[PDB]
Amino acid sequence: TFNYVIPYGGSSSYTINNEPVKAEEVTVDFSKEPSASSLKLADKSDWIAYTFNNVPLMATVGLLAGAHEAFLHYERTPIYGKRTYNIIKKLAPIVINKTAYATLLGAIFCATDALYENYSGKKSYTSGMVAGAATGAVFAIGRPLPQPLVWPLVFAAAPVIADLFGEVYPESMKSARGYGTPYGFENLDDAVPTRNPIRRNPHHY
Amino acid sequence: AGAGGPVKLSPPVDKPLPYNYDFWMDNGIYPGQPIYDGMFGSMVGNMSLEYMAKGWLVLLPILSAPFVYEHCIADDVTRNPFVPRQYPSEVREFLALFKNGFVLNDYSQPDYEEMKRRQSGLLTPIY
Amino acid sequence: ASEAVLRLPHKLRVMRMYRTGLKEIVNWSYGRHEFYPRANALRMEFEANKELSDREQIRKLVLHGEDLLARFRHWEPTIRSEFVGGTVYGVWPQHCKDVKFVPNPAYIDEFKQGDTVLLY
Amino acid sequence: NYASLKADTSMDHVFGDSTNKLNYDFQLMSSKEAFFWNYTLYPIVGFPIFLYLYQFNKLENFEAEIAAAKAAKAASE
Amino acid sequence: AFVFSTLPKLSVLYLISNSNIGSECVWWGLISLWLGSISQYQSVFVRSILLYSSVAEIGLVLLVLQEGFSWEAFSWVSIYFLSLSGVWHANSKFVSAISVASIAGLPPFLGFIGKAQILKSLVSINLGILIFSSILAATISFIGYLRLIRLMYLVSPVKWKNNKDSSFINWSTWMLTVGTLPMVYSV
Amino acid sequence: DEPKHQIPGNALDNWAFLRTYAKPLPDMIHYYYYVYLFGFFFVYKVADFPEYSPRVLVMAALIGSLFYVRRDWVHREFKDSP
Amino acid sequence: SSRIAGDTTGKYTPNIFSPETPMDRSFSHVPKNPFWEAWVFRRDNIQREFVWTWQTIFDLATFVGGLYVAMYATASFCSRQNDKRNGYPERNYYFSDSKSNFVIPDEREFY
Amino acid sequence: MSLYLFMLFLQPLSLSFVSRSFSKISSLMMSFATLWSAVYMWFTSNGANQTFYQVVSWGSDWSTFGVCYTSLYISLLCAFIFPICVILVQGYRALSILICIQTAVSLSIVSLHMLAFYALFESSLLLFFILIGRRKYGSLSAAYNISIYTFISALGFLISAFWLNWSFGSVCALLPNEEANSFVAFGIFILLWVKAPLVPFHLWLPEAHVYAPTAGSVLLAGVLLKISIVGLHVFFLPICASSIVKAFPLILSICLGSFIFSSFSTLKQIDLKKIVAYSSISHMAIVFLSSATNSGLGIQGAVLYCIAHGLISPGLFLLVGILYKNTNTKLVFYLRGLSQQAPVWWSVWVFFMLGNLAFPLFPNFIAEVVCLSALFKNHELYAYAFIFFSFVGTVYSSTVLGRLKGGVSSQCVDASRLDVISWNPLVLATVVTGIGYM
Ligand SMILES: CCCCCCCCCCCCCCCCCC(=O)OC[C@H](COP(=O)([O-])OCC(O)COP(=O)([O-])OC[C@@H](COC(=O)CCCCCCCCCCCCCCCCC)OC(=O)CCCCCCCCCCCCCCCCC)OC(=O)CCCCCCCCCCCCCCCCC
Ligand SMILES: CCCCCCCCCCCCCCCCCC(=O)OC[C@H](COP(=O)([O-])OCC(O)COP(=O)([O-])OC[C@@H](COC(=O)CCCCCCCCCCCCCCCCC)OC(=O)CCCCCCCCCCCCCCCCC)OC(=O)CCCCCCCCCCCCCCCCC
Numbered sequence A: 001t002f003n004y005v006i007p008y009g010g011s012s013s014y015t016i017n018n019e020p021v022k023a024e025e026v027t028v029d030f031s032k033e034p035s036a037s038s039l040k041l042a043d044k045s046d047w048i049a050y051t052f053n054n055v056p057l058m059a060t061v062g063l064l065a066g067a068h069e070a071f072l073h074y075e076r077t078p079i080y081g082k083r084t085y086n087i088i089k090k091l092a093p094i095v096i097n098k099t100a101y102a103t104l105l106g107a108i109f110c111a112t113d114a115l116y117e118n119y120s121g122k123k124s125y126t127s128g129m130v131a132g133a134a135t136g137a138v139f140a141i142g143r144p145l146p147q148p149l150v151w152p153l154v155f156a157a158a159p160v161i162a163d164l165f166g167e168v169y170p171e172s173m174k175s176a177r178g179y180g181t182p183y184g185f186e187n188l189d190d191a192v193p194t195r196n197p198i199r200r201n202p203h204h205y
Numbered sequence B: 001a002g003a004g005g006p007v008k009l010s011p012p013v014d015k016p017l018p019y020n021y022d023f024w025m026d027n028g029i030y031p032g033q034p035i036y037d038g039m040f041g042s043m044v045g046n047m048s049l050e051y052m053a054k055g056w057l058v059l060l061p062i063l064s065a066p067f068v069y070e071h072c073i074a075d076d077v078t079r080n081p082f083v084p085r086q087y088p089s090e091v092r093e094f095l096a097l098f099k100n101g102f103v104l105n106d107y108s109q110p111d112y113e114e115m116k117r118r119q120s121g122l123l124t125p126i127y
Numbered sequence C: 001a002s003e004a005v006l007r008l009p010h011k012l013r014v015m016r017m018y019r020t021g022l023k024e025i026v027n028w029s030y031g032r033h034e035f036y037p038r039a040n041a042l043r044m045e046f047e048a049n050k051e052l053s054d055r056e057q058i059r060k061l062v063l064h065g066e067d068l069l070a071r072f073r074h075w076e077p078t079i080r081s082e083f084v085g086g087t088v089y090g091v092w093p094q095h096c097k098d099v100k101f102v103p104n105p106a107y108i109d110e111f112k113q114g115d116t117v118l119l120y
Numbered sequence D: 001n002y003a004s005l006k007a008d009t010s011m012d013h014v015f016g017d018s019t020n021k022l023n024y025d026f027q028l029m030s031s032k033e034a035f036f037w038n039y040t041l042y043p044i045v046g047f048p049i050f051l052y053l054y055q056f057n058k059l060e061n062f063e064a065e066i067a068a069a070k071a072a073k074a075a076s077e
Numbered sequence E: 001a002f003v004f005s006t007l008p009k010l011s012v013l014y015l016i017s018n019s020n021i022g023s024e025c026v027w028w029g030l031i032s033l034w035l036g037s038i039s040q041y042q043s044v045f046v047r048s049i050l051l052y053s054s055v056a057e058i059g060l061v062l063l064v065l066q067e068g069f070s071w072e073a074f075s076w077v078s079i080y081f082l083s084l085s086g087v088w089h090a091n092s093k094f095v096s097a098i099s100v101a102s103i104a105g106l107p108p109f110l111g112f113i114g115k116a117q118i119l120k121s122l123v124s125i126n127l128g129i130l131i132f133s134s135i136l137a138a139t140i141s142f143i144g145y146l147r148l149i150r151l152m153y154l155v156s157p158v159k160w161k162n163n164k165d166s167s168f169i170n171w172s173t174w175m176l177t178v179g180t181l182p183m184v185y186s187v
Numbered sequence F: 001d002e003p004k005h006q007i008p009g010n011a012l013d014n015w016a017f018l019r020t021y022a023k024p025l026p027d028m029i030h031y032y033y034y035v036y037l038f039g040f041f042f043v044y045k046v047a048d049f050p051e052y053s054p055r056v057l058v059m060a061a062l063i064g065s066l067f068y069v070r071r072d073w074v075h076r077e078f079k080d081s082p
Numbered sequence G: 001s002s003r004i005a006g007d008t009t010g011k012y013t014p015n016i017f018s019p020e021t022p023m024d025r026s027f028s029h030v031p032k033n034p035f036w037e038a039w040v041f042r043r044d045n046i047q048r049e050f051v052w053t054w055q056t057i058f059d060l061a062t063f064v065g066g067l068y069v070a071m072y073a074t075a076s077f078c079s080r081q082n083d084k085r086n087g088y089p090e091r092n093y094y095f096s097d098s099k100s101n102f103v104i105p106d107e108r109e110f111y
Numbered sequence H: 001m002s003l004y005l006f007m008l009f010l011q012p013l014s015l016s017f018v019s020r021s022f023s024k025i026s027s028l029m030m031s032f033a034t035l036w037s038a039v040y041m042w043f044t045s046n047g048a049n050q051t052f053y054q055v056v057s058w059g060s061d062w063s064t065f066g067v068c069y070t071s072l073y074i075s076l077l078c079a080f081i082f083p084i085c086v087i088l089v090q091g092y093r094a095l096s097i098l099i100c101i102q103t104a105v106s107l108s109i110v111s112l113h114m115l116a117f118y119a120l121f122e123s124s125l126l127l128f129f130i131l132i133g134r135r136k137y138g139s140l141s142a143a144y145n146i147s148i149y150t151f152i153s154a155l156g157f158l159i160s161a162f163w164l165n166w167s168f169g170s171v172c173a174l175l176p177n178e179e180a181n182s183f184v185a186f187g188i189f190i191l192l193w194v195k196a197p198l199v200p201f202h203l204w205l206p207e208a209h210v211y212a213p214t215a216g217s218v219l220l221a222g223v224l225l226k227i228s229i230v231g232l233h234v235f236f237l238p239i240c241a242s243s244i245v246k247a248f249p250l251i252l253s254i255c256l257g258s259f260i261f262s263s264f265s266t267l268k269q270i271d272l273k274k275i276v277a278y279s280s281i282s283h284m285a286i287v288f289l290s291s292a293t294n295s296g297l298g299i300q301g302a303v304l305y306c307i308a309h310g311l312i313s314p315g316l317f318l319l320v321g322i323l324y325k326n327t328n329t330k331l332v333f334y335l336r337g338l339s340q341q342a343p344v345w346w347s348v349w350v351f352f353m354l355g356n357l358a359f360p361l362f363p364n365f366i367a368e369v370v371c372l373s374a375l376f377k378n379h380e381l382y383a384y385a386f387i388f389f390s391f392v393g394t395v396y397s398s399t400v401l402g403r404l405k406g407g408v409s410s411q412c413v414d415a416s417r418l419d420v421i422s423w424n425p426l427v428l429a430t431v432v433t434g435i436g437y438m
């Protein structure tokens, strides 16, 4: 409007609908659909199955962290001097404990997420928040004062961030095209494509 | 002499200042004062808040006794020995419109119920 | 009783109690005519117990008189206007000399007045 | 450089000594007391809010009761 | 270091774009973006700040190039070359400041156009995680570039060698300033 | 003289704590070799990993960030003992 | 011991070598106080004495969060009343879960 | 319009060719010429053209410039207030930085392209880092704060602009586009959230103002805060109205909370500049809420209040700067007896403080009345909340005035001829707007 007399923006009729018009005459899709593996892992029906399918990721991350710390300890120890102690006995707890703690935290998160979703019966943000909060509570069992408040918050926030930018964002902005005519405005006289642009072939790596 | 009277100057600060020193108002003359008198330090007349509350507790019933009778115990019919001022129909109808009017308490009138409901009007605008 | 009063010796404490009681007699009175009988009554009250030597009884008397003088503190002390706590105290305070006045302020390096950005 | 920290004792005889100090500890209200007084005073401040809530609730309840009775009268008849 | 941190990249980007060498995985660019930004912020030495900036940016560029945006990577590499030339061949404080600003992506300089091409490409693919990471990592990188600006004009008197060999350096600074308006069509 | 921030701790105790970083420093090539090797094998393996939910991925990233130990931290605390 | 720096006629010169102190802008500066300066420093740098204690958390949550909650609840009530007043269908607000798509009233439509 | 833009481009250009000794005189003459060109732009703006008074394009969508009601008022305010900043600043380096900042800001207001808007407003990012972080009187902390807050908000705005340019195909305001996306609305909103200080993103402002030079503080409060309202009216409400209506309870919560917390924080301040900075933060909340109502009464009220603030805050910052030059202190505790010692400074200070409290003969009163009317149009409680809490501003202002008004002082610290000359235009403008020539 760019005036001071009437409200800015506009209004669209709710009664009047515009019949959908295809973006192009022929649509070629270079985006592959989700794999059967993805759907299997995503299935939260059985909490135990869901947990056991998704823990490998947490275990791997714990193993990488433990390997990192163990290597740092091993690198410093001197080869030239003989050591009374056994290095593996010193280093094995590091890796084992890190992997176990990571797996336990990821198990708690996955279990609570599946159990809440089943009990509630709906896929919602709350399920992620309560799983994160429970994981952060387990993380901060014996930590000083600030940490009990901070970790349940950071952990609860992480599934919120994942849901907003991993699931809601793409579905929200699926229609936008970028070529031909703007999604909403097809009356405007813009070049109309016979086929959609294919910027890349479907990936295979 | 109103002008030129002697004054005592407040001593310069010579010790670490308290964090909440902004509660003290000092212009440089000797008797500095709190931001709000009675917030701290000497209290006027040596009377605490508890003393004032006990006084108000003793006083409040005696002061409220006249008002509670007429407003609550008494009723329109029994409040006064006469009816509200009688007006011609054209004048009376207009006067009855005013919510803050004095003609709404005429029990003798056949429109008493409506007038009473008008007097106890809306708390806030409906729209 | 305040700490400063408490630290005082016995003699100074009783002198202070008499002084404060006389001032409070003045504050609660409606005229100078009332003051004279009340002040004579206060004098007689102190004179009556002056010869007491029992320390415990003296302490009891002092403490009670201090509680009475604390409760009967006036909301409005009668203070001379020119003294601290007075209406005309500080109304137009006398200015001290040695005031630092900068003459012709705008004409000192008039062209280059302003803030500079120094850089490294 | 800095101002002198030495006081002036010229008027000490006339207006009294500065020996007596304030007894305040310069600390604020307790947290428990503050919670009570904030949650008491703020509702008093927001008196219009409660009047609007009261009237709106009364209106909505009346309207719902009217609808219920209307339904009842429109069912049999 | 300057010639071998810019020139080699063009060949690899051309190979990737022309030979369809792209993967569905976004972890590697996301990692490069975050690691580079955090390491740039925690690095005391100025050479490490400049080296980690290239890691972060080339991670983002890798993510953009996998999705088919060849034109934007070829324009980015050219702007990045011109931006890096003046910071690396430091002789004048002003040239170095304009270079750091262009690497940072400030709008009056050509560096803004180069960053804009990548960011514009990112919004088309519509991946939320990448956009969020990009914003936060860019802020962290900006703190490192502010550190560089602080070191030159706000920390201590600076004296540098009089290496008066600015072959293309004056031209590069001019091309950075002036080039924004001609290349505005791209973004 | 100007007001300055109070430094917690005694001067000699803080300096002693700072001196625990002055230890034989390994070369970074040893760490880099292993990271390059395992990273190459990891990239090859990653193509075969199952597709994970975004929420699980983000949680794994959080756990990894929390469990990551800075190289300086191990360096300061490393003791050649059982 | 003092001299007038400013010259109205415009023939102003700074006598940097004058034995007598110039009455320049620096003449009127107020003398600082060692204790006041330290108070100013302490007041500005009050983040150093911040400590996370249950009392601090309680006070913060009760006043800041409490006000924010009260304000949100009031705004939601006012929006609900306005929607009822205007006759508009329940609007789809961000956190409200409404099975209605109404957001902006149609200017052409008569409500 | 073309004359204004040309004068704007000439002002930075002139410095390159000046003698380095005539810099201040040339800069002042250029500032006055830019003001006169702005008056010419006002003369050549016909009210008959209701939508945009004038639009000029120089070959591309980026070079599309135009003036509307908001743009016209803000541009005139910037041109009116710049001469004061110029005279207050000394040195070629300082002049160069200030003139570049002004050119970038003044070009941003008239820009009609989101990407061009971003290019022009954020160009003055390093210049503020350098200005606020100057060698002796600056703070690096404040510079880092302002720079990081600006970069993060403007980057979010840039991402939203890129999506709008990809989806619609253009990002020019003159092309009617509507979006219901909440991510894009949030991206555009975050810039407005930070630039116009709103709790909890207001921390950058007070630090910057305290450690900025008086010319910088005057420019910042006078017009830099207003750049948010141009972005709202020109780049947010046309496209993202649906999201402002969807989030109105949240917007109202955040704006009222900003107003309350900022007012309470102003009570704990001992530095005059911090007091003026927190007053600005409190005042910005009403403008933001009024514009978000998307009503005629609100948009006009917000712009009017912005002009009133852009006339009252520079005055207070100027008087504070003059006092600091005279005394080298900003602590209210050290400053006493200012009534007796500076009767002329005190009169203007009291007048400006009365203006800040929105008294009837000041522009703030009319502006506040209009903004409150817009809030009352939305809901009665909305207006009541804002009206009630206004007393907190009175408490802090009264306490400050009382501390400054009386006491014992041995220093005559009054304004010189130069200081009165600098505030006279601001006083006259305040009076004229107060009498109803808004
Ligand atoms: C005079 C006429 C010039 C007008 C047009 C030019 C075309 C005719 C060439 C005529 C020569 C003039 C040179 C100008 C352009 C150079 C191109 C070129 O030459 O080859 C192109 C031409 C054919 O290729 P093409 O036209 O590109 O099209 C092929 C396909 O379309 C595939 O190619 P494609 O990549 O172009 O595909 C289209 C592309 C779309 O691509 C485009 O749109 C390109 C945009 C143009 C940008 C221009 C900047 C590029 C920088 C290079 C500067 C030129 C250097 C000159 C080098 C050669 C000198 C002769 O779509 C894409 O998405 C691909 C991405 C492309 C890259 C992205 C563009 C961004 C570039 C970076 C910009 C960032 C800004 C940085 C700074 C900017 C500041 C302002 O080749 C020839 O004609 C023969 C080459 C012969 C050259 C030398 C031989 C003569 C001498 C022989 C013996 C030499 C020894 C003796 C020495 C004698 C002197 C001592
Ligand atoms: C047997 C050989 C031993 C190695 C074992 C394995 C060998 C490698 C095999 C395969 C390697 C490929 C994959 C490994 C990770 C990729 C990184 C890499 O390889 O670079 C080379 C790297 C050395 O490169 P460099 O350039 O020489 O060192 C640069 C640093 O400055 C180094 O200097 P610095 O360490 O002294 O400084 C560390 C600095 C460096 O900074 C970083 O680490 C940046 C990384 C941040 C995130 C990375 C991207 C995340 C995306 C992951 C993508 C997958 C998920 C998809 C979606 C997720 C969306 C984010 O970070 C810190 O300051 C410590 C904090 C840790 C992260 C900071 C973020 C905290 C956020 C949490 C918030 C909670 C706080 C709230 C309360 C706060 C109160 C106010 O080598 C390794 O570190 C490998 C060790 C493997 C341990 C990784 C632990 C988990 C791995 C996956 C989790 C993903 C997060 C990454 C966390 C830490 C990774 C460094």
Ligand SMILES: CCCCCCCCCCCCCCCCCC(=O)OC[C@H](COP(=O)([O-])OCC(O)COP(=O)([O-])OC[C@@H](COC(=O)CCCCCCCCCCCCCCCCC)OC(=O)CCCCCCCCCCCCCCCCC)OC(=O)CCCCCCCCCCCCCCCCC
Pocket (backbone or CB within 6 Å): C119, E093, E094, E097, E098, E101, E107, E108, E153, E169, E170, E171, E173, E174, E177, E178, H012, H013, H015, H016, H092, H093, H096, H097, H100, H101, H103, H104, H119, H120, H123, H124, H125, H126, H127, H130
């Ligand atoms: C045809 C008929 C003829 C009619 C004339 C028509 C011709 C049209 C234009 C011709 C005019 C000459 C152009 C001037 C070139 C040199 C200017 C310069 O060096 O600046 C400082 C210089 C002062 O020199 P100095 O005091 O003797 O000492 C400097 C020493 O060399 C070193 O001193 P330092 O080491 O102590 O450094 C301290 C530094 C503190 O450190 C910093 O702050 C560094 C910050 C990094 C850059 C600042 C970032 C923000 C700058 C925003 C741009 C300002 C305009 C804002 C408008 C928004 C535009 C999107 O502070 C400064 O240097 C000044 C602060 C503000 C100036 C920054 C603006 C300059 C931007 C780039 C300059 C152009 C160089 C190109 C090089 C060409 C070949 C080498 O010139 C000035 O008087 C102020 C700047 C004038 C700006 C106009 C230049 C145009 C740039 C705007 C970009 C728009 C695109 C270009 C199109 C222009 C029209 C086609």
Ligand SMILES: CCCCCCCCCCCCCCCCCC(=O)O[C@@H](COC(=O)CCCCCCCCCCCCCCC)COP(=O)(O)OCC[N+](C)(C)C
Pocket (backbone or CB within 6 Å): E164, E165, E166, E167, E168, E171
């Ligand atoms: C549409 C254009 C925009 C797109 C940009 C890309 C296209 C480029 C278009 C213009 C390119 C201009 C490149 C500018 C280079 C600047 C010139 C230069 O570097 O000269 C050097 C050259 O230095 C040398 O090493 C000379 C060696 C070779 C000389 C030139 C080689 C010429 C070969 C033929 C080139 C013709 C092209 C062939 C057919 C296209 C001299 O500098 P120094 O003496 O080393 O130090 C300077 C000292 N100081 C400035 C401080 C005083």
Ligand SMILES: CCCCCCCCCCCCCCCCCCCC(=O)O[C@H](COC(=O)CCCCCCCCCCCCCC)COP(=O)(O)OCCN
Pocket (backbone or CB within 6 Å): A120, A122, A124, A125, A126, A127, A153, A154, A156, A157, A160, A164, G095
């Ligand atoms: C940058 C965003 C990160 C959030 C920052 C918040 C502050 C961090 C503190 C950590 C707290 C953990 C994160 C909580 C934020 C979510 C908001 C809570 C609201 C809420 O509980 O409603 C849920 C939906 O909200 C939602 O989950 C979607 C709301 C989106 C979050 C807010 C977006 C804007 C915030 C940005 C403010 C400033 C940015 C700076 C960080 C339930 O929904 P439901 O569907 O489950 O219904 C229930 C049917 N069972």
Ligand SMILES: CCCCCCCCCCCCCCCCCCCC(=O)O[C@H](COC(=O)CCCCCCCCCCCCCC)COP(=O)(O)OCCN
Pocket (backbone or CB within 6 Å): D042, D043, D045, D046, D049, D053, G061, G062, G065, G066, G067, G069, G070, G071, G073, G074, G076, G077, H381, H385
């Ligand atoms: C960790 C962070 C937080 C931890 C601590 C938080 C503790 C705060 C909890 C209480 C805070 C105040 C209470 C407000 C929320 C009460 C419960 C919310 C549910 C609700 O909306 O009920 C409405 C409350 O009344 C209302 O509409 C609001 C009444 C109270 C507002 C006025 C009180 C103070 C006034 C001060 C000014 C603030 C507002 C200024 C505009 C009335 O129910 P409904 O009819 O709307 O039905 C709507 C369907 N539930």
Ligand SMILES: CCCCCCCCCCCCCCCCCCCC(=O)O[C@H](COC(=O)CCCCCCCCCCCCCC)COP(=O)(O)OCCN
Pocket (backbone or CB within 6 Å): A164, A168, E123, E131, G093, G094, G095, G096, G097, H156, H159, H160, H163, H182, H183, H184, H185, H186, H187, H188, H189, H243, H244, H247, H250, H251, H254
């Ligand atoms: C917790 C209180 C919220 C704090 C914000 C207070 C006031 C902000 C209002 C700004 C006005 C316009 C912004 C539009 C929405 C922003 C926040 C609205 C509240 C919100 O989070 O709603 C969510 C949807 O919004 C979204 O999905 C987007 C959320 C924002 C994204 C965060 C960062 C995005 C940055 C992207 C940069 C540019 C990207 C451009 C491509 C979920 O609500 P729901 O509808 O699902 O209800 C389910 C509950 N049961």
